[PDB]
């Protein structure tokens with residue numbers, strides 16, 4: 001049976017659009033998914049998006065012979081400063097496949113052995129920050145984790161120190177990057193993009209694009225002149241050759257990759273870590289298990305690569321945090337041809353889809369009745385997870401190139417956090433989820449009591 005798909009509440013000639021007039025649009029879409037179910041159509045004057053929430057349907061949409069990565073309105077506006085970087089390029093664009101093939105060995109598990117020492121440098125900065133806090137003081141979790149992860153990609157990306165822990169006041173790159181991401185994410189909700197009440201936003205966006213371009217072009221130019229061969233993504237991209245085309249990346253596409261990376265570091269792995277610590281202090285049985293592992297495995301003052309690989313339960317904690325609050329909550333796809341989804345939903349070539357990863361990860365048919373429970377033990381058998389059930393890093397050849405990088409950093413940092421401190425939810429924090437490009441807990445504070453283990 002061919003069926004009509006449900007649609008949420010309309011607003012006259014604006015259709016669904018005003019439902020985007022919130023700073024918590026994923027959360028609203030999750031609430032809409034709870035009401036309407038495995039698939040609903042979302043219509044604006046400009047476009048139509050079909051939202052997928054079931055494993056059944058999402059496993060079809062993850063067929064690369066039938067569907068390809070789409071740029072949502074948001075990614076299309078991110079492209080104004082991330083250009084044809086790996087994140088904002090179409091799959092069939094020459095520059096996607098070039099950068100993909102050149103950078104893939106830079107992001108392998110083997111390569112993490114190289115980034116390790118630099119990840120540890122920033123990890124120790126956090127631990128030492130927290131060791132030096134006075135007894136009557138708390139930790140601003142997403143704030144400090146976003147400091148750690150930004151600095152990690154600065155050092156590994158292009159051997160630059162943001163020094164995030166050494167200032168309250170942000171780096172001028174980061175003011176512009178955050179304001180551009182805000183404007184990119186806010187544009188699609190405007191009924192009339194071209195009203196003079198958005199001319200100041202338009203001016204500020206152009207300025208922020210220029211600021212980001214100027215500063216990364218200088219970095220690229222300084223590196224080309226020094227001939228300096230640091231083991232960072234920038235050297236790799238400067239010496240890189242695509243085996244297919246035989247071409248290197250042009251300086252402009254390298255600018256887009258650095259901008260892309262700096263966005264990923266600031267938005268994503270910070271959210272994973274913040275949500276991990278949240279679920280630990282709210283599940284002290286799980287916190288105690290994570291902490292015993294950290295204590296038993298991290299027997300040296302500085303964690304080795306090998307020792308991070310051995311933090312299995314910390315790894316399980318991270319996966320279960322990515323299940324309930326995938327900090328990157330969505331990916332879009334398009335129909336490569338006319339076709340039928342789940343034998344029920346006729347699609348035309350070019351029709352846009354959106355996977356709500358938070359809903360896929362709540363599918364009771366996949367995860368059973370205890371779906372809202374935080375149980376890392378769900379991942380204890382890694383091979384029991386069905387195909388296309390857990391997609392915190394997207395799908396196929398357009399999956400996250402930084403997945404090995406993010407889980408290494410996350411495991412390293414959470415390991416060291418659990419070794420060096422006990423954590424109290426002193427304020428009985430009520431989950432409040434701030435949405436940028438990514439989901440983070442807003443206002444999440446804890447107290448860390450030092451376990452007095454020397455570094």
Ligand code: HEM
Pocket residue numbers: 069086087100153260261262264265268269272326327328330331332391392393394395397398399400401402403405406407
């Ligand atoms: C916990 C951390 C992270 C999560 C949850 C995450 C999630 C994702 C997701 C869902 C996608 C696919 C987007 C789509 O289909 O539209 C993606 C793509 C990407 N991510 Fe991440 N990400 C993380 C960390 C990182 C980091 C640290 C980097 C780089 C420093 C990074 C770089 C990228 C890139 C370059 C792509 C585009 C890959 C391509 O299509 O070739 N990510 N990420």
Ligand SMILES: CCCCCCCCCC(=O)N[C@H]1CCOC1=O
Pocket residue numbers: 020025026072073074075188328329330331354437438
């Ligand atoms: C990978 C992290 C970013 C997640 C994707 C951003 C989009 C999530 C919410 C959503 O569906 N918004 C629609 C509104 C119109 O066009 C969009 O883009």
